[PDB]
Design a protein around this nucleic acid. Structure first.
Ligand SMILES: [Mg+2]
Ligand SMILES: [Zn+2]
Ligand SMILES: [Zn+2]
Ligand SMILES: [Zn+2]
Ligand SMILES: [Zn+2]
Lengths: 263, 114, 232, 379, 65, 203, 46, 335, 56, 84, 43
RNA sequence: AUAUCA
């Protein structure tokens, strides 16, 4: 087609395995960094506690509520409250979640991310839905109550990035490898007898030609072709972790061009 | 307690420009751009692209201390060529490269049935 | 703005001599002038904390609105056909432009050679809308009318920006205007300063004027507390 | 823990049983009530922020709850009876009829003189209002420690053996691992956090794994803490295998045995893993010894240590600065410090420390008998 | 005490997987290593989260008020 | 005189130029650049009588007098911090000190307990495009949180044909794919309606 | 409405004032708690 | 012993110490809170009047602010409560008790204090986080580590006292000590470990990294040194790019067991005009050694120049090792 | 002598022997809170009106 | 007793301690609004002013150098060699 | 808590050293550093 | 006073 090229190896709701060729390592990495840190997500940010009869602390629970993944598909049409014009929050900038739970049962009563209810007007946008990947359809286990154990609270979810808090991290681990045969001599293999026998062969070795000993060292050789795997948490779909990552980095660069323009 | 606010990493300070371009004294046709509320994510990316420019003689960046999200980038170009223009072109090249990367990923993704 | 000043006074009978003296000393005869001031305070019905968004203490203060009026509004029929000069003082839709001022209590210091007061001022040029009267606008800011006074006098322009005002003040109420200065005139000498130098230079100018009138009329530094408009 | 009122209680948010365990721990109830968490630990040279017993923490992990802890302090106060008439009282003191009030705020007190549980507090604020009537009455109230803050957890009212009304107040905070915060492995390998890096800055395996902790290679040699390295290797196998790693003393487990098992899992037998630099993405020329190691959070946290003074309370007798952080004391410029100043030749710097910066006073003496006899009616 | 939502090292939600893991052990008799892997917990950082958890909450619930 | 303000919510720093070119064949000349500050204040009074806003807007025009118009509850107050704009009579009788400052400085330093600055939008290096009987001003508005949008100021002496002029500019916006924008030409004294229009288009 | 103090064991609400008798109604136990403020507390979810 | 010969003092501060590869030898990282408490009484003078008035305006809560104003009259104005804390108009001769600020001289000390070097004068550097940060090479004189050590800070109150600190006991002055007539500070840990690794014959650096390594040197002439290898592929050696930190005029010669002018084992040391000719840099060269690169630099160029060299050598070395990496495992005990 | 080890038994003897301390030791001036006669304080500093009037 | 200028035998060079004390003293005096004997070439820090005065030997101070017997030699800052 | 209920104090020939007779009765490692070293035994 | 910290 044009410049750098992609070749997807495997896909799911949760994973994207692909090959990125005709790219600078610096670019591959900068994208990898952005996916981890700069993609916006919606996550619980304020927790007003009306009642808590639980064995857990108000803030212990509060902390967990932030780590619960929320639907951030249409996150782009929500404003950062900081940029919003209200007094604290509103609809244009937040999602209000409610949680009322009580131990009616003699048996232990469980509190799940499913038990969260949206109270704010969604403006008909795909946002704030607790992500349920759970087979039984419960989502994240927030708490356990016994008998008169009541938990009544209110959550304000806000747009944010992983730089502010890791709760707004839409990506789990991002796998990243290049040159499975150390052709580039980018690592000096620690060994005891044989580095080839001692160090396990990469999966990606199959997608590259072995060096063949009867050849001189390619110094001219440079790093292109990157075997990556992007894992999603739920907030954004796997593809959009890649796309939005590409786009964020693009926007980030545009700001610099624009800054120079104003100067 | 002595902990700085987390947004200080990305949100520009009161009266604080993203870029501050100062000229290098020690070398002819060389400049020093300080990037506020930025990290390696952008620094190493730009530096590597300026390296691809033939008319660029020197390019390097450094995050002087990790408590602060800012980096100094030094650009030296051949006489007649402007380092601000060099930075402008590398910035553009990056965008155009990313634009193709997105297009190529999108096309390839749409082909998958999973 | 920093206003450095000194005050004094004289009884009605001292008028002519003082005018004659200031005319010779400054080289120019007096210039007639007036001004109406309306003072406003935070609405007592409303109540707000006295702190910043940064949670820093803020002291409630009065806002002063001031403008002029055409002299003809101060001359009745008995006053009619009387030289419109310095001698007259003896026989005593939208909003208009106004001067809006908030002042600070003068600078502290024992043995101050002059009074030094900081003054925050802005100018109101006009208004429009539902409630465009200056009164409504003050209310919109959360303030209410407290009191107002009229001042009539003569001024002298001197060197280095020194100005001398010989004034009479009347508080205004439907119950009637009462002359705060009944008996004589309030004398004021001052310079408005927008660097330490120009401040010490201005003090000198005032000190030389004080020195030049010593023996005849005395100019001194009024009590700080008497120049404090804070509400309490 | 939730039902007891003790001065100070430290509880770990998410305790973990160790991957490497002793057969003896079964009896010690350790796996049921643990003292730490299994951290992903890289023994590497990174930004040099892990030099001389310091360590780097994954700021990303810290956000996710790694090493956070609950903190409960309990403040007590009595309503004492001083003889036939004088009795202290629980109430909200009014500043007009009450002497020597605390500069802190009393607004958070209900009319019984207590804060209701749930209110958030902060430094210098008044938890318990008390007055010791003597005549109208002095202020005997209890303020929260100035170096701390949090939310009131529980407040209880009681009478004692003889029936003196007394009240206990619990205050809960959550302490999130900061910089000078001390941690150690189970091998006398202690240290404080030097810096916290986010996930992107951290070095990473091709597999996408990142360390929670970066400890310096320079620890290991001089110290000869071999079991630390073995703990790790075994814990790595344990984590993959899902079997309890037996780290018991006198056994037939060998570093070779564990090595073989790790190779069966796809990793390089001696625990090394190739890492990529977080800032550039470029492979590290070195391969990092990487795997889980059980790290402990210790009682020494920077914020309970940090202290500064510049004029403050003085003793009555000596008229010199009071003692300890607690009392807002000044530090001791002691004998050995005097010596260094004398060695430097800092004559005026010393005079200042001993006079202006502390003790300094003025007397009038007699010229005949060099005594402090002089009745100076200096006025 | 109480399963961590999200693995500390990579942040893969682990909050849902608890009961499911405990079930694959009692009901399925399965060994810990297979259950973890069944649940898709492949990286050791994620594995250690569940494998080394101590659900103290369950004891805490044993006290009346 | 007449005016209208168009605020392009959905846009990027580039949108300005895109619209700038859609007029390339309508342009005539280009006068000096302009500037503008848009502040939002929130009242701290807690007894505020029902239906009295808690919001007050401050619109500062640069070299439109260095003037600042305050707008609250559909009412406006025009102020100036320019000693050169002081009515001569006020300087002569001493009502004024001859050295004024901004109403915003006064608000933040003397009335800060009553009024708190919530937001501050600034538009620098704006462009003055001169067409046929219609002056069109363009400027990129920025907040403390990066780009905030594009602002179009439409001033026309020609009291007549105007509704057409505004519709025309809105059309060139359709061309550059600038959808989801707000336009105001409302009214409450020129400077006042103009100021009001900014409020309607931005609030 | 209003529960000044709660009971430690039986968990029955008490609502008593100054000099009322520091004890519970039914069970003996002089323990007694305080019951949360009605001034709802908000926490950052970080 | 306890109230006269030693006493506790005001303008003192104490906290947990931690290291920093980005601090200069002679500076000390001071937590914002500590800086906001400790004060220097500055006399209102034509030179500072405007600045001082601003810190007064800034007040006790903002960082570069002030706590008190001392009038001629003797009475102390508390900026925290004075109703006139805003409209405070300074007069020559008054004193503004202002916060401790970047580059103030301060006494830093690690107890016991069995050394004059156990108390040295550092430049303030107000920083975030609750720990006192120190340059790693200054670790040895104090005898500090970061396993939970705390350190003491004393603030001079007079222009005289400050001079005493800056002019007699400042860290650079203390480098060569009379205890053993040799340097008492040298290159340690990461920087020592990385310095050997960098300076092997095997060690070659590509252009990209050379540029970053060069820019990292804060006094770099702007001159890209000619690569030791010009085609096939321009390549620089460790020795080469380390020599950029070594100042001109610096001459050093050392022969270790088996050193020839051909140094086959890359033995000993040969630095001509502050450029390494042969041998690997390690403890004997860059440590707190009698013949040391440091001993020569302090003596030949100055204490201020040598102090800069510490920072320089570390900024290059640490940067290089950050990207090279270095670890240690059980495999290293296996024979 | 009293600042090391024998303190009170040294000051009693100091009394009955009517000792006179010339205050040249560093210890004395420290007890007295005066600038010790060591390095910086081993000499005196004077203004000379001659040299002063010479520079102007 | 005071040793005559023609019989002075202490170093013709200024001691580290002397220089530190002169700089301290001048800086202190400069800071207490004392008259400055040099062109401040934009200088504002009294120590940097002191350094400048000593650099041009325009400091009107004299070092009274005491000998163990009690006698002394007076030396002008203008006359002392500053090799430090 | 456990190790505190197994602590031994020894008040006032070479007591601090680990004796052979301490085998199986007292912990060879659990002892303080400084002043009380080897005088505080743990069962 | 015990415990503890380097
Ligand atoms: Mg230590
Ligand atoms: Zn909003
Ligand atoms: Zn006597
Ligand atoms: Zn994980
Ligand atoms: Zn009961």
């Amino acid at each position: 087609e044009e410049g750098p090229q992609v070749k997807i190896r495997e896909a799911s709701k949760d994973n994207v395995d692909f090959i990125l060729s005709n790219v600078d390592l610096a670019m591959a990495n900068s994208l990898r960094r952005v996916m981890i840190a700069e993609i916006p997500t919606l996550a619980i940010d304020s927790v007003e506690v009306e009642t808590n009869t639980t064995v857990l602390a108000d803030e212990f629970i509060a902390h967990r509520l932030g780590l619960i993944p929320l639907q951030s598909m249409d996150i782009e049409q929500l404003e950062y409250s900081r940029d919003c014009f209200c007094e604290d929050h509103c609809d244009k900038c937040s999602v209000v979640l409610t949680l009322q739970a009580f131990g009616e049962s003699e048996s232990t009563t469980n509190v799940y991310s499913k038990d969260l209810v949206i109270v704010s007007n969604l403006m008909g946008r795909n946002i704030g839905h607790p992500i349920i990947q759970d087979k039984e359809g419960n989502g994240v286990l927030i708490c356990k109550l016994r008998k008169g154990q009541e938990l009544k609270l209110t959550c304000v979810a806000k747009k944010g990035i992983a730089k502010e808090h890791a709760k707004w991290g839409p990506a789990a681990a991002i796998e990243f490898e290049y040159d499975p045969w150390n052709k580039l001599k980018h690592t000096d293999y620690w060994y005891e007898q044989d580095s080839a026998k001692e160090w396990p062969q990469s999966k990606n070795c199959e997608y590259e030609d072995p060096p063949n000993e009867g050849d001189p060292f390619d110094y001219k050789a440079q790093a292109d072709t990157f075997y990556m795997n992007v894992e999603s948490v739920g907030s954004i779909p796997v593809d959009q972790v890649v796309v939005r990552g590409i786009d964020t980095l693009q926007k980030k660069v545009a700001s610099i061009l624009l800054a120079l323009t104003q100067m | 307690m002595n902990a700085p606010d987390r947004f200080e990493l990305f949100l520009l300070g009161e009266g604080e420009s993203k870029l501050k371009i100062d000229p290098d004294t020690k070398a002819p046709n060389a400049v020093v751009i300080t990037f506020e509320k930025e990290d390696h994510t952008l620094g190493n990316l730009i530096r590597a692209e300026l390296l691809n420019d033939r008319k660029v003689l020197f390019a390097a960046y450094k995050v002087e201390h990790p408590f602060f999200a800012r980096f100094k980038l030094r650009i030296q170009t051949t006489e007649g060529y402007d380092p601000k223009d060099a930075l402008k072109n590398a910035c553009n090249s990056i965008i155009n490269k990313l634009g193709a990367l997105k297009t190529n990923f999108e096309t390839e993704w749409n082909l998958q049935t999973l | 703005v920093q206003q450095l000043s000194l005050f004094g006074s004289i009884g009605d009978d001292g008028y002519d001599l003082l005018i004659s003296t200031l005319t010779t000393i400054s080289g120019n005869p007096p210039l007639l002038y007036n001004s109406l001031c309306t003072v406003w305070k935070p609405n007592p019905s409303y109540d707000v904390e006295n702190v910043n968004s940064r949670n820093q203490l803020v002291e409630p203060n009065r806002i002063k609105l001031s403008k002029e009026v055409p002299f003809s509004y101060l001359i009745d029929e008995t006053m009619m056909d009387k030289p419109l000069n310095f001698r007259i003082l003896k026989s005593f839709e939208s909003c208009s432009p106004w001067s809006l001022q908030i002042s600070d209590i003068p600078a502290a210091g024992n043995n101050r050679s002059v009074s030094m007061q900081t003054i925050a001022e802005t100018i109101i040029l006009s208004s429009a809308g539902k409630n465009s009267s200056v009164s409504s606008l003050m209310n919109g800011l959360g303030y209410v009318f407290e009191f107002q006074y009229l001042t009539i006098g003569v001024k002298f322009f001197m060197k280095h920006g020194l100005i001398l005002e010989l004034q009479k003040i009347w508080q205004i109420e439907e119950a009637g205007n009462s002359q705060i200065t009944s008996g004589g005139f309030l004398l004021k000498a001052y310079i408005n300063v927008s660097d330490i130098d120009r401040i010490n230079y201005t003090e000198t100018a005032l000190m030389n004027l004080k020195k030049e009138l010593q023996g005849y009329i005395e100019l001194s530094v009024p009590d700080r507390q008497s120049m404090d408009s804070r509400v309490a | 823990y939730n039902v007891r009122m003790d001065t100070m209680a430290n509880i770990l948010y998410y305790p973990q049983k160790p991957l490497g365990t002793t057969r003896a721990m079964e009896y010690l109830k350790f796996r049921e009530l643990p003292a730490g968490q299994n951290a992903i630990v890289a023994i590497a040279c990174y930004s040099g922020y892990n030099q001389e017993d310091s360590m780097i923490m994954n700021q990303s992990s810290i956000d996710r709850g790694l090493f956070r802890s609950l903190f409960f302090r309990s403040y007590m106060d009595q309503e004492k009876k001083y003889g036939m008439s004088i009795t202290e009282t629980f109430e909200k003191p009014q500043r007009t009829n009450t002497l020597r009030m605390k500069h802190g705020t009393y607004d958070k007190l209900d009319d019984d003189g207590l804060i209701a549980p749930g209110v958030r507090v902060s430094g210098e604020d008044v938890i318990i209002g008390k007055t010791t009537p003597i005549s109208s009455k002095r202020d005997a109230s209890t303020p929260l420690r100035s170096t701390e803050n949090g939310i009131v957890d529980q407040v209880l009212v009681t009478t004692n053996q003889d029936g003196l009304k007394f009240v206990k107040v619990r205050v809960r905070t959550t302490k999130i691992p900061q910089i000078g915060d001390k941690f150690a492995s189970r091998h006398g390998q202690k240290g404080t956090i030097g810096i916290t890096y986010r996930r992107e800055d951290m070095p990473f395996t091709a597999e996408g794994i990142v360390p929670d902790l970066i400890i310096n290679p320079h620890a290991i040699p001089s110290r000869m803490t071999v079991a630390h390295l073995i703990e790790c290797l075994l814990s790595k196998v344990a984590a993959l295998s899902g079997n309890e790693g037996d780290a018991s003393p006198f056994t037939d487990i060998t570093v070779e045995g564990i090595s073989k098992l790790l190779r069966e899992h796809g990793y390089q037998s001696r625990g090394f893993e190739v890492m990529y630099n977080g800032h550039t993405g470029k492979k590290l020329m070195a391969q990092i010894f990487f795997g889980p190691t059980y790290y402990q959070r210790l009682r020494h946290m920077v914020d309970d240590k940090i202290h500064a003074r510049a004029r403050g309370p003085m003793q009555v007798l000596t008229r010199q600065p009071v003692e300890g952080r607690s009392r807002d004391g000044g530090l001791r410029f002691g004998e050995m410090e005097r010596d260094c100043m004398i060695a430097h030749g800092a004559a005026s710097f010393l005079k200042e420390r001993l006079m202006e910066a502390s003790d300094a006073f003025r007397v009038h003496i007699c010229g005949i008998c060099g005594l402090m006899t002089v009745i100076a009616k200096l006025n | 005490m109480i399963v961590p939502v999200r693995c500390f090292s990579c942040g893969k939600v682990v909050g849902d997987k608890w009961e499911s893991y405990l079930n694959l052990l009692q009901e399925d008799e399965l060994d810990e290593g297979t259950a973890l892997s069944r649940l898709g917990l492949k990286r050791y950082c994620c594995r250690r989260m569940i494998l080394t958890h101590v659900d103290l909450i369950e004891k805490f619930l044993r006290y009346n008020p | 005189g007449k005016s209208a303000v168009i605020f392009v919510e959905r846009a990027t720093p580039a949108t300005l130029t895109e619209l700038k070119d859609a007029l390339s064949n309508s342009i005539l000349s280009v006068r000096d650049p302009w500037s503008i500050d848009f502040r939002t204040y929130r009242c701290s009074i807690k007894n505020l009588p029902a239906d009295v806003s808690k919001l007050m807007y401050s619109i500062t025009f640069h070299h439109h007098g260095r003037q600042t118009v305050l707008i609250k509850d559909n009412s406006a107050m025009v102020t100036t911090a320019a000693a050169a704009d002081i009515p001569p009579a006020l300087v002569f009788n001493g009502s004024s000190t001859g050295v004024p400052e901004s109403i915003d400085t006064i608000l933040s330093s003397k009335l800060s307990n009553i009024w708190m600055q919530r937001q501050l939008i600034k538009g620098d290096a704006g462009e003055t495009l001169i067409l046929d009987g219609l002056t069109v001003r363009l400027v990129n508005l920025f907040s403390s949180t990066g780009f905030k949008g594009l602002l179009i100021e439409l001033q026309a002496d020609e009291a007549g044909e105007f509704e057409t002029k505004i519709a025309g500019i809105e059309g060139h916006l359709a061309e550059i794919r600038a959808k989801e924008y707000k336009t105001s030409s409302d009214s409450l004294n020129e400077i006042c309606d103009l100021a009001y229009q900014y409020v309607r288009a931005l609030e | 409405a209003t529960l000044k103090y709660i009971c430690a064991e039986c968990s029955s609400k008490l609502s008593l004032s100054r000099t009322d008798a520091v004890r519970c109604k039914d069970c003996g136990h002089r323990i007694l708690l305080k019951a949360r403020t009605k001034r709802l507390v908000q926490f950052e979810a970080r | 012993r306890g109230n006269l010969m030693g006493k506790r003092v005001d303008f003192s501060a104490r906290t947990v110490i931690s290291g920093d590869p980005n601090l200069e030898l002679d500076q000390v990282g001071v937590p914002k809170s500590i800086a906001k408490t400790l004060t220097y009484p500055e006399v209102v003078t034509p030179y500072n009047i405007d600045r001082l008035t601003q810190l007064v305006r800034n007040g006790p809560n903002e960082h570069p602010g002030a706590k008190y104003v001392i009038r001629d009259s003797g009475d102390r104005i508390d900026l925290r409560y004075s109703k006139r804390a805003g409209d405070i108009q300074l007069q020559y001769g008054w004193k503004v008790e202002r916060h401790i600020m970047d580059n103030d001289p301060v006494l830093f000390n690690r107890q016991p204090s069995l050394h004059k070097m156990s108390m040295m004068a550092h430049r303030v550097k107000v920083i975030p986080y609750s720990t006192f940060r120190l340059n790693l090479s200054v670790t040895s004189p104090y005898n500090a580590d970061f396993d939970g050590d705390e350190m003491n800070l004393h603030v001079p109150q007079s222009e005289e006292t400050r001079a005493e600190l800056s002019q007699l006991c400042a860290v650079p002055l203390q480098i060569v000590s009379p205890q053993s007539n040799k340097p008492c500070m040298g290159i340690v840990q990461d920087t020592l470990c990385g310095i050997r690794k960098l300076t092997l014959r095997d060690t070659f650096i590509e252009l990209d990294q050379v540029l970053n390594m060069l820019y990292w040197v804060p006094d770099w002439d702007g001159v890209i040194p000619t690569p030791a290898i010009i085609k096939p592929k321009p390549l620089w050696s460790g020795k080469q790019i380390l020599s950029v930190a070594i100042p001109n005029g610096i001459h050093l010669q050392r022969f270790d067991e088996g050193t020839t002018l051909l140094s086959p084992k890359d033995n000993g040391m040969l630095i001509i005009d502050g450029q390494i000719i042969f041998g690997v840099v390690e403890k004997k060269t860059v440590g707190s050694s009698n013949g040391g690169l440091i001993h020569v630099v302090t003596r030949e160029k100055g204490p201020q120049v040598c102090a800069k060299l510490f920072g320089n050598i570390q900024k290059v070395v640490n940067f290089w090792l950050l990207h090279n990496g270095f670890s240690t495992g059980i495999g290293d005990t296996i024979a | 002598r009293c600042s090391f080890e024998e303190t009170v038994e040294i000051l009693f003897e100091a009394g009955a022997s009517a000792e006179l301390d010339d205050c040249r030791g560093v210890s004395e001036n420290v007890i007295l809170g005066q600038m010790a006669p060591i390095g910086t304080g081993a000499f005196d500093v004077m203004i000379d009106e001659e040299s002063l009037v010479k520079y102007m | 007793k005071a040793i005559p200028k023609d019989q002075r035998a202490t170093t013709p060079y200024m001691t580290k301690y002397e220089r530190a004390r002169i700089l301290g003293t001048r800086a202190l005096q400069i800071s207490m609004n004392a008259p400055v004997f040099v062109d401040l070439e934009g200088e504002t820090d009294p120590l940097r002013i002191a350094m400048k005065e000593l650099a041009e030997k325009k400091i009107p101070l004299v070092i009274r150098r005491y000998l163990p017997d009690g006698s002394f030699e007076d030396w002008s800052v203008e006359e002392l060699i500053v090799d430090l | 808590t456990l190790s505190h209920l197994r602590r031994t104090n020894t008040p006032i020939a070479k007591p601090r050293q680990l004796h052979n007779t301490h085998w199986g009765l007292v912990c060879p490692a659990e002892t303080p550093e400084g002043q009380a070293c080897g005088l505080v035994k743990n069962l």
